[PDB]
Design a protein around this ligand. Sequence first.
Ligand code: ADP
Ligand code: ADP
Ligand code: GLN
Ligand code: GLN
Ligand code: NET
Ligand code: ORN
Ligand code: CL
Ligand code: CL
Ligand code: CL
Ligand code: CL
Ligand code: K
Ligand code: K
Ligand code: K
Ligand code: K
Ligand code: K
Ligand code: K
Ligand code: K
Ligand code: K
Ligand code: MN
Ligand code: MN
Ligand code: MN
Lengths: 1058, 379
Amino acid sequence: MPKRTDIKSILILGAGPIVIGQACEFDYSGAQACKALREEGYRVILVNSNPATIMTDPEMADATYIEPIHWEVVRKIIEKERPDAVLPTMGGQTALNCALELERQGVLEEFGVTMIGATADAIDKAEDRRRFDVAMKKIGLETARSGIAHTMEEALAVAADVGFPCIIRPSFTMGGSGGGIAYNREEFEEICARGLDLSPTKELLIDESLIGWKEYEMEVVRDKNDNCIIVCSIENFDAMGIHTGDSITVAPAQTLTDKEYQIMRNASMAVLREIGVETGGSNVQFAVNPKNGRLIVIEMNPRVSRSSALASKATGFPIAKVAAKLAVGYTLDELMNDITGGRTPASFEPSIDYVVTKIPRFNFEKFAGANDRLTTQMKSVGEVMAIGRTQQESLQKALRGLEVGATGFDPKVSLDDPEALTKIRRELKDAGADRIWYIADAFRAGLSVDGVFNLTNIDRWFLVQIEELVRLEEKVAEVGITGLNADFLRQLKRKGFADARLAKLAGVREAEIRKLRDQYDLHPVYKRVDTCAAEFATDTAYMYSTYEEECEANPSTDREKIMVLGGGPNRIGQGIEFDYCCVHASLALREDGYETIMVNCNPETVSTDYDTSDRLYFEPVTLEDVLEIVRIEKPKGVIVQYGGQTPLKLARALEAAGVPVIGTSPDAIDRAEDRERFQHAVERLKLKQPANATVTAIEMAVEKAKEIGYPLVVRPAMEIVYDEADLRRYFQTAVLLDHFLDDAVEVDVDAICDGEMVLIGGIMEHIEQAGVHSGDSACSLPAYTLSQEIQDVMRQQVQKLAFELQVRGLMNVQFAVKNNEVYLIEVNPRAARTVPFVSKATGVPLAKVAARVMAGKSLAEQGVTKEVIPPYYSVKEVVLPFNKFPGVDPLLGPEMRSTGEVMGVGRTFAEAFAKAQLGSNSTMKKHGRALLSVREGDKERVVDLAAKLLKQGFELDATHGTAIVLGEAGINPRLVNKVHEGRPHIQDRIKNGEYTYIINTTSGRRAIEDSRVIRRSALQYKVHYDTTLNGGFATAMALNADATEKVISVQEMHAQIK
Amino acid sequence: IKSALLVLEDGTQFHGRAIGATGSAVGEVVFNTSMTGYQEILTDPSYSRQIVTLTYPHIGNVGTNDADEESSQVHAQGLVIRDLPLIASNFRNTEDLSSYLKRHNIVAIADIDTRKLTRLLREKGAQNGCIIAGDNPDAALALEKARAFPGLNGMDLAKEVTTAEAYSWTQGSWTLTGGLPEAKKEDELPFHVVAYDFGAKRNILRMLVDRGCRLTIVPAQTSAEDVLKMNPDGIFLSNGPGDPAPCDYAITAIQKFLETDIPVFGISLGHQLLALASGAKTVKMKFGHHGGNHPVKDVEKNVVMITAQNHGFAVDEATLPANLRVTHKSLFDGTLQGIHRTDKPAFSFQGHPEASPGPHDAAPLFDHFIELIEQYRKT
Ligand SMILES: Nc1ncnc2c1ncn2[C@@H]1O[C@H](COP(=O)(O)OP(=O)(O)O)[C@@H](O)[C@H]1O
Ligand SMILES: Nc1ncnc2c1ncn2[C@@H]1O[C@H](COP(=O)(O)OP(=O)(O)O)[C@@H](O)[C@H]1O
Ligand SMILES: NC(=O)CC[C@H](N)C(=O)O
Ligand SMILES: NC(=O)CC[C@H](N)C(=O)O
Ligand SMILES: CC[N+](CC)(CC)CC
Ligand SMILES: NCCC[C@H](N)C(=O)O
Ligand SMILES: [Cl-]
Ligand SMILES: [Cl-]
Ligand SMILES: [Cl-]
Ligand SMILES: [Cl-]
Ligand SMILES: [K+]
Ligand SMILES: [K+]
Ligand SMILES: [K+]
Ligand SMILES: [K+]
Ligand SMILES: [K+]
Ligand SMILES: [K+]
Ligand SMILES: [K+]
Ligand SMILES: [K+]
Ligand SMILES: [Mn+2]
Ligand SMILES: [Mn+2]
Ligand SMILES: [Mn+2]
């Protein structure tokens, strides 16, 4: 059948803030779902707490709800919106869980909401590991030997049965959340306990080890007519034992014979049939015994995923789009294949004539105390993808587009290090994020392919290819730039070698290698993605570079082109926010009539969606790669200011290679980023800047420190030193020196300048004080405490800076307010991570506007001149990854560690704050017992807070010092013992669940390291805790409000603006 | 350095590396989109006189093995690929690709822009070509050979690959666990099927054996009279190379069978042959159907199947006799894919129900053929 007619309105459950394991891929998919359903004339209602999503753009749907993804709130939406149906398959696990709760709570029944895409029963049959295993057994597929556990006791029994190592997998979780590999009883109990508490169904499945087996995945699609297809096959580079998401993966499968592939194929279809997925997609995972082809089914995800997004990008088949349409009656045969001009149907299996490689991106360096070994629980924060005509080519391109400083297989250990083989061995046996690089070092050191295989279990098929690269690298090293004849250099380029890598081996600058290529006329050609190995023509321009014969670029001579450079894989501090900005530029200028070119290689994003731009080059965002595209496109302008650090770092080289960079100049940017040039401007403008010094030696800094004043901010990574002694201390373990502004209010200001005028986009007031990175702080728009007086100064200061620096497009300025005095922290002459948040609260699409400006259309011309001040409060809160890295102290500081964010809308700051807090998955309660433990400076303020909590009906506990101060104020908390004090101590109490709230503030490298237990315990037992007094006051305010009371759509919000 | 060269009729040149035997190869050039199953593809007699280009860049990843041979030899005239892997990596492998090719004396070339070639064949249509592998490949000679190739249109190749003498086939399908079975015993197979060898693929035979048919493989030219004398439970028309058109003997014989009540089923060439005997016409496609991801709709049920295709000629749907009903169509191009005689127990499929390599979606085609057979024995 065609589209359903009993359904007019659909509610889509979004994924919420970005976290490790549940990232951008859901904005991409939710965006595709919304677009597909809206295309088909349906009423689109969606909920998503993450504001930096394209999917929440007001124009993307009918009723958009940026509200906490909690069943009670969704219930409100439903009530208010009365959806005919709910699509729960496009928002990761959050969506699945939420649809099932709504269902259990009888909400769906209450409002006659129909579940489309997948049924509650099918979702459960897949998510419930026990049910899953049964299903397999029914269809005669094999699964590893396992046992279900609902308690520790239960668990220990399975362990006893399967032996160690054993794999632990919770029901109702993904990205390996709550799981891992137990190598002993100690590890085992640790994992299970965490897994049992995390699992929404309180259930664990423990399986025997298949570690080392090959790992595969298939992306399937099934329609109501029972038509079913394999969209993509994926073979993992890293074997079973390392999560698919933390693994290097390639499409399509490489090492399966046709006969094995068919079995796998048949099984994947049978899995969906058995689970009951009849109108959508699913991901099916397997393990294969390389020694005999033995097939074992692992799991199945009854929705879109990170792999379906990788798959869509890999084949060019928009899985989410298709699946949306299938959710409403359409059949595969009735839909057309986008990329082949819609000349062929969606009912077919793609065929690709290239190799797709995905490499995960990590951020261990940011989690000092964390276990950095790869396991079954995802620790990656992002991913990069690359396409090449060969595996070598594909792999190398991915490497140089990883944004880790790699240009390919750069060495990690020196050849003359006697200890090298030992480290190398360790790195191969027990994989960390650097393993790919250690593999080449192994071949460099004399290790055989077999040797490396026995340690890594990575298929020889891949290994032999890396070794080949090494040997070639050895020749290059040997012949030097002189031996780089046109033939050899072509062979090299065909293997995917970057100029930068060749440069290093030859011992020359990268520009020298590139010079050489220009001399030999050695350039790449561009092939297009088409889902069909060129069997049909395409009208889409989705390309990748390769060193082959025929070029399919065929650039137009017709239009004025604008190129937009993405940020590659996301990392902490470089997320979706930047992508969002990048997308907007494209959409805006495209709408204005430009030919938009997008350059990026993040598979998870909307930017790499062929629909977002006129031409998409899925390439490494490097100087080499970008110059080649410019070479043939000959754009009018290039934007480097919207993809974050990646494209920003290229600006200068690009400009010098002769690239028409538009918007704020490379130099201006430089002016602002360079500590020196900046200090000089600030000076010139007569503005306030914290005292600073540039020390070279220890004793030098001690002296200078004396000068500047404690506390101090030591910028090389970033720390805060308090006393002289404290300075040495650092120096040991350990350069800009800056005076630290204690008890200061941090502020963010996003604005636009067209060289004629400055448009203030938004002044945000951080909840957490300066010292807690802006990226990890909650913030309010409009400010909730700052004076109008003080805000105007900043506004004025912004404008001064704007012109001085010659800003053209977006800019962001960071201030600190101490004693009614405004101090300048820094200037970011580019788009900031706060842009999307601001655009949503204010209704002004800042990125679009700045884009238009950069492209030549003044603010005045656009009619965007007046600063908007919403008639509501918008609060932004973040989500931190501490739960992923337990050995880390879950405490805030000057270094950003958050992975995502949420928005809270309210008539009052408190109401906003409560919505943002609940949305951030807080466990705060409106009753119980609180635990106070603060530091010196806070001792004064804590009394009021204690009173506030008391007013709220909370019972108080406190440690000695704190108890003292409260007691002296007339407040007698219940004394509680530190850990070294006796019993019971805080630790014991936390663990028994005595507390529902914790306020714990610290100051001092020691005082911190001492108090670490309170924070680690709070996190582990799920107790909301604030590590800032300011934070605690907000939480307190929020207790007065009801996040579930009232819901508002973005459309309605926007409409409220004057 | 081991040079190799591939030249098309139109003058297009592709320079690469030799990965097989030394020499020259001439034939019609085609592209197959199968990401897996290269060995099976190479050993398909249907590819006789054709130069096979694979669109999937890495070919030989799994090496080769006997069980993956669809016939006693490599029938493809030449192999054209983008990349030959350093090693074969699969528990099933018994000999690397290059070694295998040399063994079968096949001229093959690697390292060329197969995408450019594919796009060319798609846009311009099939073309004859010549691969030359040796010390110094003569591009003018290659172009000569290619231009001189008589071409597939009007070429009977079925009589070229068929078996000399009739023989029995009672061996079933392969299994992961057990491998290739031991040939069944005649008393262990209920039905007796007579299969015309027009260059039949092993999988078809095995699958038929899987369904209880004991087979008698007969030379392409075998008369209907001789067949009829064997008291067949059913008559099967195998797949194979060239034009079906010029195969007078077959058409003639088939017509005979069509006078009888003996169930007839045909695959690809057999489909064509059936249609011809039924008075329908066959055409040469621009580039054909070569791959394993081709959607075919069963128009009766309105269901789609992902199929394995390997054909350059098709049955014109617009010349189909009223006694020939359409049963399946290509969702790719709208071309005819299946037909059933409205008045006789005879039907055929353009695709490969037996797959190998490819999706198993179309195998039920066989079941129908069993139906007929069962029914026929009823009478
Ligand atoms: N029996 C096993 N032996 C070894 N590794 C396993 C086993 N089962 C699963 N794994 C590993 O655990 C990872 C997570 O398993 P999975 O079932 O996919 O859970 P999730 O839903 O969290 O992704 C898999 O990608 C795989 O590499
Ligand atoms: N001199 C200072 N006084 C107080 N807080 C500061 C000072 N310098 C920086 N900070 C804190 O450090 C954070 C990051 O410093 P910043 O210079 O903005 O580095 P980044 O390049 O990561 O943005 C700020 O968001 C703020 O909370
Ligand atoms: N790259 C292109 O511009 C290709 C145009 C043409 N439609 C093709 O697919 O061959
Ligand atoms: N695959 C076959 O059995 C035959 C196909 C037929 N020879 C053609 O090229 O159309
Ligand atoms: C992965 C997202 N969560 C699980 C569904 C945990 C942060 C939502 C609470
Ligand atoms: N905005 C950062 C998270 C706040 C956390 N509850 C803390 O106070 O540490
Ligand atoms: Cl989860
Ligand atoms: Cl085994
Ligand atoms: Cl950890
Ligand atoms: Cl070529
Ligand atoms: K309904
Ligand atoms: K699952
Ligand atoms: K089992
Ligand atoms: K893996
Ligand atoms: K997966
Ligand atoms: K802050
Ligand atoms: K910065
Ligand atoms: K070549
Ligand atoms: Mn899962
Ligand atoms: Mn998984
Ligand atoms: Mn900053």
